[PDB]
Structure 1
Amino acid sequence: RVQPIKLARVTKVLGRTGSQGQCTQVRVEFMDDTSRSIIRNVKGPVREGDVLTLLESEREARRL
């Protein structure tokens, strides 16, 4: 029933966020489906072309 942990690869970096620069928003496409892609805010040093894991499918989508 619960959604399994999946993987998403960063394609683009959408700039910092978090009121202190401590997060960066990145557009990530799921390794399962190349077409399906969302935007998520992540912490730590991120560069385009790296894979990060997701414990949930949807959390957030906004443009600053």
Structure 2
Amino acid sequence: QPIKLARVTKVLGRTGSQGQCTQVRVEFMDDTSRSIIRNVKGPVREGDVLTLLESEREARRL
């Protein structure tokens, strides 16, 4: 598994039972025309970069 970092481009909602994992969509920085949607744990604003351990997991949207 290669390590890829990607920039949050819009924050969408909170997911999880205790309302703890902020669901955002990100776009990868080398493949800037590509996007994915990730459940992200913690304090997240728009415009920060996440270190994805894998590019390919994509979650549901509630």
TM-score past 0.5 threshold: yes
Stretches of structure 2 lacking an aligned partner (at least 5 in a row)? none
Alpha-carbon displacement from aligned partner over 1:3-47 (angstroms, at most 9, x marks no partner):
311100000011000111110111000001111000000101000
1:63 counterpart SS class: coil
TM-score normalized by structure 1? 0.89
Aligned-residue sequence identity (percent) comes to 100
- For this pair of structures, how many residues does the alignment match? 62
Alpha-carbon RMSD across the aligned residues, in angstroms, is 0.9
Name the larger-Rg structure.
1
Give, in whole Å, the separation in 2 of the partners of 1:38 and 1:15: 15
Stretches of structure 1 lacking an aligned partner (at least 5 in a row)? none
